[PDB]
Each structure stands twice: as C-alpha cells, then as structure tokens.
C-alpha cells in the first residue's frame, strides 16, 4: 500500500471525484486498462484506493452486504446506514486473511437529505463530510480541501482546483500514472469530466 | 406403529422394497456400450415442445470422459448427480488419470442406503434413493457402461435399459441389439426401444442424446443432431 489517490469535492448536488488508473503489482503497472471505481448499485459508488489489489477485495464484500440490506429495506439504500455498516464490516475484515486497509469513498444519493459523501480511513473511521480526500493522497489533500470551498463547492472553481492538484500528485507523489478518470456523478447518471 | 426401517416378515427391509417401484413413475435411461463409444439416451419427459430445450438437463457430464443418464425418481436424481460431479472430480484431481466408469459407480452406491431415523443426521439420508443411474464413459481399457441401482449392485453392462417399465425397456433390447454392432446402429437401437419404454411420442424436444467416445469428451446433441437420430429408428 501507500500508493494510489482519491479526491472528492461535493457541490450543490454534484460530486466531482478523480482517481488515477494504475494497478501496480511489484514494480510494474499490471492492469491499467480497467478502472477500479465500482458501481455497487446504480445510486451508489465505492472508489477504493490504497493497495491496488486490496480494492477489488473490499468492493466485493460490500457488494453482497449492500444488497442484503437493500432486500431488508426492500427500497434503495440510506447514506447514514452505508457509512456505518461499511465501516463496521471493514474494521473487522482488516484483521481477517481477506483484509481491508483502504481509504474508501462512498458516494450515494440519499432518499431524503440529498447528496452524501462519506469518509473512510485505512484505520477505518466513519464520518459524513463535505470536504475530504483519500489514499496516500489524503494526507496531502485534506488541508487544501479544507480551504478552497466556503461550505461546499462550486464547479467552476473546483475545475481549476482539480487540474492544479493533478499536476501536484504526479510531481511530488509517486504513482505509475499516465491517465486519470475524472467523473461527476449527479446521483442517477455517471458523467465523464476531462483528464489533465 | 413401527418404522419403514424395520424388517418385514419376509426377512427384507421395507424401505428398499418400496424404492424400486418408485422408479417406474418417471424417466428412462438407455445406455448402449459399443467399442466405438458409449451412448446415453434419456427422455426429457415433456408436456409440450413449447418447453425450451435450451437447458433441460438430465444427461449431465460427471467428468469430461464419463457421462451419466438418469432414470427413476427425477427429483431425487438431481441432487445425486450434482454430488457425484464433485466426488469424481476429487478423484480426477488427485490421480490425474482419466476416470474409469467402474470407479464412479462403486463410489455413489454406498450413498444409496444410509437411511434411518436413527444413526443419521441432516447431511445423511432418512430415506433410500430410488434412483437407478447409468454411468457410460470411455477409459484407458476402453468403453465400459455400468448400471447402479438403489441396492448398490454395480455390474458391467454391454447394453442396459431401465425406464418406466424397467422390464419393458429390457425385453425390447434383446430383440434389437446384438453384441458387435456399429456406433450408428447403437444410437438407433436406443430410439426404437425409447419409444417402447415411454408412453409418450418421439419428438426432438422429448429426447436428449449424448455420446462419449475415444479421444472425445462428453458431447451434448443439438436440435439438428437430435433430429438425425430420431430419423434412425
């Protein structure tokens, strides 16, 4: 681990997120023609970053859980519920041979409140917030993410903010990277935003 | 009252006696073993041809050189074959040879009777199987066909038929089949008997054909080849 980046800035209802394409095992980038931003449902995204290998492992475990709860409700997921359950499940799985030690990012559209973004650590501490960053990148990004909105974001300033950070991650932080996926999810459709 | 786990005044088990008669309600298994392959013919047991033949399974591959056709109580058979697939494959996995038809047959026969409402638990039986199987495949020695029945008797077969009339299915065999005969006649000899043992018609959606042959795995017949064989009666 101690590679791989995430950043999310939530807007008026939008949320923009980006992560790098690059799954490196050993010394070289094994996969890169796949993305590791997963649709766990069509209203919910988990973007996992830390261990390149570890991301799929966590995604799958949540995928069965998220659905079992969906059954229970028999209507779409609740954001509050998704942060706590994924947190509990992941702290217990960290000790497990099937580990987790990922900084994950929940994006969900909530049935009542609206847009929700849920913070998760590698240690795995649940918090809803509206200014948060993930991966090795979280130490680097979080003060900056504190500063640049007033409450939440505005997309124009965010766009400028995002391009500026993406030169920095290659510059100071060390990834194998050559392409980045930039996405805004409004809560019902996936939008592609442009790569820098 | 007393069990079905008790002996009858004949000096035979009550539950095993009932099981053979149970077979007779359902499907047929005809396997003819020739020295050019082992063929399995079984009835899909339809109510209409408007029942998709896309993935009706009753002849299933146990291994990729051994196939199995089932007869008798069709429901009870579905779990027996699924189970049979893992055990044959544990054997294939360890030995790394092509499984012999006689080894698969012996192994499944002890599972037939473990019945009893004492000395058994949920993973064990509380009833005997009434499924008679025909395992047909090609091994190192060559093509062999084995018959298994609920009493665990395993026997070597050159032609064995069991069906809706077990007795009926067999009497026709004597009449049609003869010891040394071609593959193409072997498939045909099954379609003429198949009708006799069924009370139902010859439809392409109502029969299922599979051949396991030298150098060649278990093959499932498609709608065109199902028709070639129906033509051969």
């Amino acid at each position: 681990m101690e590679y791989l980046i995430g950043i999310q800035g939530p807007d008026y209802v939008l949320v923009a997120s980006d992560r790098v394409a690059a799954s490196n095992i050993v010394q070289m980038k094994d996969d890169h023609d796949k993305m590791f931003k997963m649709s766990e449902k069509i209203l919910l995204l988990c973007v996992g970053e830390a261990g390149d290998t570890v991301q799929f492992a966590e995604y799958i475990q949540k995928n069965v859980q998220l659905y079992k709860m969906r059954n229970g409700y028999e209507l779409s997921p609740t954001a509050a519920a998704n942060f706590t359950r994924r947190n509990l499940a992941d702290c217990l799985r960290s000790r497990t041979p099937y580990h987790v030690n990922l900084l994950l990012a929940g994006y969900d559209e909530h049935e009542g409140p609206a847009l929700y973004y849920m913070d998760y650590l590698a240690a795995l501490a649940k918090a809803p917030f509206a200014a948060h960053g993930y991966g090795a990148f979280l130490t680097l990004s979080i003060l900056d993410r504190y500063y640049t909105p007033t409450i939440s974001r505005e997309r124009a300033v965010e766009l400028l903010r995002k391009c500026l950070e993406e030169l920095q991650k290659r510059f100071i932080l060390n990834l194998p990277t050559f392409s980045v996926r930039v996405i805004d999810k409004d809560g019902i459709h996936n939008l592609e935003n442009i790569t820098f | 009252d007393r069990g079905v786990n008790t002996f009858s005044p004949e000096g035979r088990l009550f539950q095993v006696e009932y099981a053979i008669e149970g077979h007779k309600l359902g499907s047929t298994a005809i396997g003819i073993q020739t020295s050019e392959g082992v063929c399995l013919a079984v009835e899909k047991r339809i109510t209409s041809p408007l029942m998709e033949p896309s993935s009706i399974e009753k002849i299933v591959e146990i291994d990729a050189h051994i196939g199995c056709a089932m007869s008798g109580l069709i429901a009870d058979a579905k779990t027996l074959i699924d189970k049979a697939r893992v055990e044959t494959q544990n054997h294939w996995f360890t030995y790394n040879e092509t499984m012999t038809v006689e080894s698969v047959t012996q192994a499944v026969s002890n599972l037939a009777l473990q019945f009893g409402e004492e000395d058994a638990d949920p993973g064990a039986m509380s009833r005997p199987f009434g499924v008679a199987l025909l395992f047909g495949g090609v091994d190192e020695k060559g093509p062999q066909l084995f018959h298994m029945d609920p009493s665990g008797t395993f026997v070597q077969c050159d032609a064995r038929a069991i069906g809706s009339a077990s007795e009926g299915a067999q009497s026709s065999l004597q009449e049609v089949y003869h010891k040394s005969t071609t593959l193409k006649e072997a498939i045909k000899s099954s379609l003429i008997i198949l009708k006799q043992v069924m009370e139902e018609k010859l439809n392409a959606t109502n029969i299922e054909l599979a051949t396991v042959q030298p150098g060649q795995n278990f093959h499932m017949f498609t709608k065109e080849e199902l028709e070639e064989v129906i033509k051969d009666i």
């Binding site: - | 069990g3 035979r12 095993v16 026997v155």
Partner: protein
C-alpha cells in the same frame, strides 16, 4: 407379533425376531465359500447379474490389499461396512505398519453392527461377510452375521444352498490347512458348484476369487486366472 415392532422391544424367545429376519437377508444372498490354509486365506464367491445383456460382476469387494470381504446379503450394506474397514486398514498402516490383526479387525465391525440393534427400530445390517485376512497369527477366515457375534471358522460357507457346500468343507476339513494355494482355490470352486444343482455349473464368467496371504496382496480374478482353478468337476448328487 408385537415384540419385533422395534429391535428395542425384547422377545420372550430369548433373541429378538428382528435379529433373526436379518439372518434371512444373508441366506437369500450369494453362495460363498471361505477356506484357509496356513499361509493364505481364500474367498470364493458366486457372481450374479441383474440383466441378460450384462456381464456378471464381482461379489468380492476390496477392503484393501491385505484384508478383503465377500458379501452375502445386500451389496450396499456390505459396502457400508466396507468403507469403515477400508479406513481401519488405512490407519493400521499408519500406526503398526503391518496388516491389521484379523481378530481385532472383526471385533471393531461388531461394535458397529451392535449399534442399530441398540437403537429404536433401526435395522441391523443384513450382510454376512466371510473375511479373509492375513496377520502375524496366520490366515483367518471369519464369519460375521447380522448380530455382533463373530465365529472363527476353519471353513464356512454362507448364503443360498450352502449346506451342500458345507458337507464339502467337512469332508476336506484337515486338507485345506496343509495344501498349496492353487489347491485352496480349487476345493472352493468344487464346494461352490455343489450349491448349484447337477445341471448348473460354474463357468469363468460367474466366478470371482479373492486371494490374500503372506506372499501377496488382495487380487481379484474375474477372468484374470479363474480358468486353471475352474478345471475338474465334482458336484453333490441331488
């Protein structure tokens, strides 16, 4: 009556009727002669097929390459006892690294047979096995029944029409013991042919032989070398 309604319910006969029903299952089963020498133990069994267009198959089932069984009763029930027996041989090899003592081996089976006989209405296993084994004591041919009681026999024949085979064992009671291994199999086929009427006589197809001993593993001859032994008739005049 109402004293065989379960095997827990005792009979005022001194032996439950249900124990005795199980004895009929074995009689209804295959004629089998079991004899021993002082090096080898031989199991001669009669095959049977369930169809006309079928080639008869062994009623000798392997426990292993050092202890082996012949079934008289149900094939399934014999195999059910067999699996336990197979395990013991697999453990014997781990612990002792010899062929498991035959007398020991039979008592553990007897313990298992004992259990449904204790349970409520449950079935005692309706096979009799003639068990041929070779240990450090010598060959043993044992008779096991549907009860937990085992007999150590010099020669015993169980199954269908076995009394005619039994008078043969009596006549050549001393002879088996001194003889060479080929002869031991030869008296067994002569005895086994005695069960059958004068008309019906043993042929290579329906003859299964299990030989175990000092010098060799358990081998089944179904047409492997059945023939030189088969040679010479001597049947009981019915």
């Amino acid at each position: 009556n109402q004293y065989d309604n379960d095997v827990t319910v005792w009979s005022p006969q001194g032996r439950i009727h249900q124990i005795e029903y199980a004895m009929e299952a074995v009689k209804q089963g295959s004629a089998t002669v079991g004899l021993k020498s002082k090096t080898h133990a031989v199991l001669v069994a009669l095959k049977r097929a369930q169809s006309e267009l079928a080639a008869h198959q062994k009623k000798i089932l392997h426990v292993d390459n050092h202890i082996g069984i012949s079934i008289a009763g149900l094939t399934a029930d014999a195999r059910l006892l067999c699996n336990f027996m197979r395990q013991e041989c697999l453990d014997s090899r781990f612990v002792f690294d010899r062929p498991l003592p035959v007398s020991r081996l039979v008592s553990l089976i007897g313990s298992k047979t004992q259990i449904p006989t204790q349970r409520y209405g449950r079935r005692p296993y309706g096979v009799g096995l003639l068990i041929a084994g070779y240990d450090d004591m010598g060959p043993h041919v044992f008779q096991t029944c549907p009860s937990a009681n085992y007999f150590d026999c010099r020669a015993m024949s169980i199954g269908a029409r076995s009394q005619s085979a039994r008078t043969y064992l009596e006549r050549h009671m001393s002879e088996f013991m001194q003889c060479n291994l080929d002869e031991l199999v030869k008296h067994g086929l002569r005895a086994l042919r005695e069960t059958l009427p004068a008309e019906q006589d043993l042929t290579t197809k329906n003859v299964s032989i299990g030989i175990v001993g000092k010098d060799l593993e358990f081998t089944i001859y179904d047409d492997d070398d059945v023939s030189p032994f088969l040679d010479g008739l001597e049947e009981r005049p019915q």
